[PDB]
Each structure stands twice: as structure tokens, then as C-alpha cells.
């Protein structure tokens, strides 16, 4: 129990918050408390949200600069270059599938013109001021002389920061040995930020408990939440079932003309380990062993690709994060236009690359995604109440894609 203690504490905090909210609503309520006591009652959760929002800027910028600078063509070769594109394409497909399923099934269900929305998206992709982008983004309103007038409004331009960090990292990659000092600087800043993040995660259970208690106090019919939350789970699992049994096998067959289910039968046992442990790092050795022995993939392919995919290629996490973003948007009565969906997909692909191969590795990336589209982050406490279940299917889908990519590259090598 010492391992995964934080996951247990998050679930216990959710239960305690539910009990606290029900007790406060029963013996009194929000009306009896009044705004004075209500605002102070939810304050620890607000402090948690402020800390999460604070660490977003350095984390995103430094990690993306390092990730872009490290894409050395020689270190990848043709095999790694093709593997990285396969990873990107399948993550994009998983994100699109999650968004589409959550829009079609509506788990959470109970303005600006189109051209102006696209133009605002383009202006935010290329911000005109790096310092302003850390706390503002461009938005267009209309004045009736309806002519559009735009200006910078409050809210961190996460998408612009992501684009700048990637482009700056590509510049550092071009400089190579000349950019070594900046590469070390941003890497060490990222490590210090990660220390801060680990400190924040220890405070997280208290903030989560009070966030849950506040939401339960505000809610009228709590029993309705569990009707939507359960539906949310379905949208996740179904997605994992479609990506893992239809989409990825179809890609493997289309590039290989071989049975993908024989490959999956060769990797069943690492998949069982991935479900049981909810960790990609724990199932990587078994995965390499089974892919080499049962599926006949050369060691120079498996021992290179699978360790990278274990960290980098996370289709399950991306599908879960997109489903969660759409589910929270539906819970909050917010409307998702094409600009917000595009932002969700892009930030989800980057965050799925950045998500960790550990239990509940995708939650902080989900917080980043929600912040990127101005969605309520306090709803995250709802999705981590069932993360012990969704995350294991996520891990299965995360390791299966690595295995199938290795098999595809092995087939290409065998044909050449």
C-alpha cells in the first residue's frame, strides 16, 4: 500500500469530500452557511487550483523546448523517424475518436463568428508578445457601428506558448552543440519545476477533498452525477475498445497484410500486466520479451522502439483526456466550437507525449488541457474518482500501440 499511496489518498479524499458535502447540505447547507462561510469552505481547493495554474508555464515551456531540441536525426535514423510519425498519427486518431464519441454519446449532457474564431486561433498560435502570452490571449468582440474589434484579454495563451517552445527547441536542435547551454538551462529548470510539482501533489488530497465537498454542497441532485460519471466511463472504455480492437489492427493489417490478432495473442500477457499494474514501465520488460520471442521482432527494433514508446506513445491517455475535456465541457454547459476542439486535440497530443507512464499519469496533462480551453479544472475531482478504472484501460492501449508499431517496423525491415 506504500506504493500507489497517493492514488489511494485521492480516492479517500473524494469519499471524504462527498461525505462532507452531504453532511453540510443536510445539516444546513449553502443557504445556512452564507457566502462568508461558503467562500472560506472551498478555499483549500482554490489554493490547489492556483498552485496547479502557477506551475503550468515553466513546465510546458521547458519540457517542450527539451523535447524539440532532442530530435537528433542521427539518433533516430529512418526507423525512429518512422516510429515517431506512427506515434503522432495514432495519438491524433485516438484523440479524434475520443472527441467524436464524447460528442455523439453526450456523457455530460442532462457568440463569435466562424471566421473570427479561426482568425483568433491563428493570432493566438503566433502571439505578438511572449511576455503577454504568459497571462493574456487575443480575443475578438464586435461593435455595432457588427465590425470585429480584437484585443488581449485575461487568460494564459497556452497554445501560443506551446508553439513558441516547440519552435525554439527546433532552433536549439539546429544549433546543436552551440545551443548546449540553453538546452541544459531549460532541462534543469524543468527538473526544479518537477520537484515543485511533486510537492504540490502531496498537498493535492486536501484541496481535492474540499473541492469535492464544495461541488456536492452546490449540487441539488447528487444521484444524477453518478448517472453521468458512469456514462463518462463508458465513453472512455468504448473508445479504448475501438482504438485497440479496430483502428490499430486495421493500420497494422493495411501496412503488413498479416493478422493483427495473432500479434495481440502473442502480447496478451504483457497486456494483462499493463491492466493489473496500470504502469507502462512495469510491463515494458515483459513486452520486449514477448514481442521478441512470440512475435519474432528483432532486438535492435524492440530494444530501441518499445522503450521510447513506453514513455512517448500514449493513445489511451489521449483518448481519455479528450473524452474528459468534452465531458467537463458538457457538465459546465459550455459550448465547444471547432477552435476549442482543435485546441483540445493539439494540447492533448502534446500532453499525451508528455504524460508519465505511471498510474494516474494523465491527470496533470488533463488540467493543462482544460486550462488551454478555459474549462473548469475543479471538475477534475470527478474524473479522478474513477481514474483507478479508466487508467488501466489507458495503460493497455498505451502499450499495445508500441507493440504494433514495433511489429510494423519489423515487417518493413523483413520486406527490405
Amino acid at each position, epitope marked *: 500500500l506504500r506504493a500507489n499511496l497517493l492514488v489511494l489518498l485521492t480516492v479517500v479524499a473524494v469519499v471524504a469530500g462527498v461525505a462532507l458535502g452531504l453532511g453540510v447540505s443536510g445539516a444546513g447547507g449553502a443557504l445556512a452557511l452564507g457566502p462568508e462561510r461558503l467562500s472560506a469552505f472551498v478555499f483549500p481547493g482554490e489554493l490547489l487550483l492556483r498552485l496547479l495554474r502557477m506551475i503550468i508555464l515553466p513546465l510546458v515551456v521547458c519540457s517542450l523546448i527539451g523535447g524539440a531540441a532532442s530530435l537528433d536525426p542521427g*539518433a*533516430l535514423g529512418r526507423l525512429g523517424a518512422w516510429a515517431l510519425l506512427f506515434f503522432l498519427v495514432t495519438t491524433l486518431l485516438a484523440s479524434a475518436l475520443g472527441v467524436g464519441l464524447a460528442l455523439a454519446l453526450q456523457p455530460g449532457a442532462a457568440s463569435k463568428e466562424v471566421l473570427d474564431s479561426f482568425l483568433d486561433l491563428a493570432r493566438n498560435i503566433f502571439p505578438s508578445n511572449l511576455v503577454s502570452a504568459a497571462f493574456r490571449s487575443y480575443s475578438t468582440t464586435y461593435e455595432e457601428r457588427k465590425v470585429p474589434v480584437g484585443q488581449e484579454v485575461e487568460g494564459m495563451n497556452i497554445l501560443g506558448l506551446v508553439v513558441f517552445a516547440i519552435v525554439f527547441g527546433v532552433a536549439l536542435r539546429k544549433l546543436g*552543440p552551440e545551443g548546449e547551454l540553453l538546452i541544459r538551462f531549460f532541462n534543469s529548470f524543468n527538473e526544479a519545476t518537477m520537484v515543485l510539482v511533486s510537492w504540490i501533489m502531496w498537498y493535492a488530497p486536501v484541496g481535492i477533498m474540499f473541492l469535492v465537498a464544495g461541488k456536492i454542497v452546490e449540487m441539488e441532485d447528487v444521484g444524477l452525477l453518478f448517472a453521468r460519471l458512469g456514462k463518462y466511463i463508458l465513453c472512455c472504455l468504448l473508445g479504448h475498445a475501438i482504438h485497440g480492437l479496430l483502428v490499430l489492427p486495421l493500420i497494422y493489417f493495411l501496412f503488413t497484410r498479416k493478422n493483427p490478432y495473432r500479434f495481440l495473442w502473442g502480447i496478451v500477457t504483457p497486456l494483462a500486466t499493463a491492466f493489473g499494474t496500470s504502469s507502462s514501465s512495469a510491463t515494458l520488460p515483459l513486452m520486449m520479451k514477448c514481442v521478441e520471442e512470440n512475435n519474432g521482432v528483432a532486438k*535492435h*527494433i524492440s*530494444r530501441f522502439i518499445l522503450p521510447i514508446g513506453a*514513455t512517448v506513445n500514449m493513445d489511451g491517455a489521449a483518448l481519455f483526456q479528450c473524452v474528459a475535456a468534452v465531458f467537463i465541457a458538457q457538465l459546465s454547459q459550455q459550448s465547444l466550437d471547432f477552435v476549442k476542439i482543435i485546441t483540445i486535440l493539439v494540447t492533448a497530443t502534446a500532453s499525451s507525449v508528455g504524460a508519465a507512464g505511471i498510474p494516474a499519469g494523465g491527470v496533470l496533462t488533463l488540467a493543462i488541457i482544460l486550462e488551454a480551453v478555459n474549462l473548469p479544472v475543479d471538475h477534475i475531482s470527478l474524473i479522478l474518482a474513477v481514474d483507478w478504472l479508466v487508467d488501466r484501460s489507458c495503460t493497455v492501449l498505451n502499450v499495445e500501440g508500441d507493440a504494433l508499431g514495433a511489429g510494423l517496423l519489423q515487417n518493413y525491415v523483413d520486406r527490405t
Partner: nanobody, 115 residues
Framework: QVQLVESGGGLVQPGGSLRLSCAAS????????MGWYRQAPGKQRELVAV???????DYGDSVKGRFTISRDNAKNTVYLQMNSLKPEDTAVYYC??????????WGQGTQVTVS
């Protein structure tokens, strides 16, 4: 964090041999590739050799056949064995160690002169 220590450079005669060594010390989560690039005076940097986890290797077009990259799997060190050296091989050689999509470490560079 990784610290790269380079050794084995200097001046040599045409047709001679050198053995560069790049040793990585410290902590890296996942070392994917280790290798050498070189930059001649006035030209862009060019790949010399890579060895990746799993054993695959790659070489630059000019140095294929003569140069050989090898790994000491015990202490996470790479060796570049340069044979039949030619005046065109005079350059600054940088070793690098890469964790793909995480970070890259570049060496300070060693001058190699063939004359």
C-alpha cells in the same frame, strides 16, 4: 543529469589511427543513442557515427568502412575507432547522448588534426 567526458583527440599522421572515447556519467532515465558528429572549418556539422540501444549503428558516408563505433555496456561509454585517417578527417568532434523527446547532451568537442 549527464556529464560527458571526451578523450582521445589530437594530432595524427595520414593513414594513422585514433580512438575517441565519450563517457556519460550521472543519471539519465533512458539513453536511446550515443554518437559523434564533426564540424570541419567552414562547413556544417556532419554525422560521424551513432550507436543506439538495441545495437543498431549508423555511420557518415565519408567514414563508412574506416570508422567503427562500439559500446562498453558496463560503464555507458562509447568508443570511436578511426582507421586510415585522411586530411579530410581534420575537424572538431562532438559526442552526444540523447533521450529522444526528453533532452540531448553535447560534448565540448575534441580537435582532430590529420597532417
Amino acid at each position: 543529469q549527464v556529464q560527458l567526458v571526451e578523450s582521445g583527440g589530437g594530432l595524427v599522421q595520414p593513414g594513422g589511427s585514433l580512438r575517441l572515447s565519450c563517457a556519460a556519467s550521472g543519471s539519465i532515465f533512458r539513453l536511446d543513442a550515443m554518437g559523434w558528429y564533426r564540424q570541419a572549418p567552414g562547413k556544417q556539422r556532419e554525422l560521424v557515427a551513432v550507436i543506439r540501444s538495441g545495437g543498431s549503428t549508423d555511420y557518415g558516408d565519408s567514414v563508412k568502412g574506416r570508422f567503427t563505433i562500439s559500446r562498453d555496456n558496463a560503464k555507458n561509454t562509447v568508443y570511436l575507432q578511426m582507421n586510415s585517417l585522411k586530411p579530410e578527417d581534420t575537424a572538431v568532434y562532438y559526442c552526444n547522448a540523447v533521450q529522444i523527446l526528453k533532452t540531448i547532451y553535447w560534448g565540448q568537442g575534441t580537435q582532430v588534426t590529420v597532417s
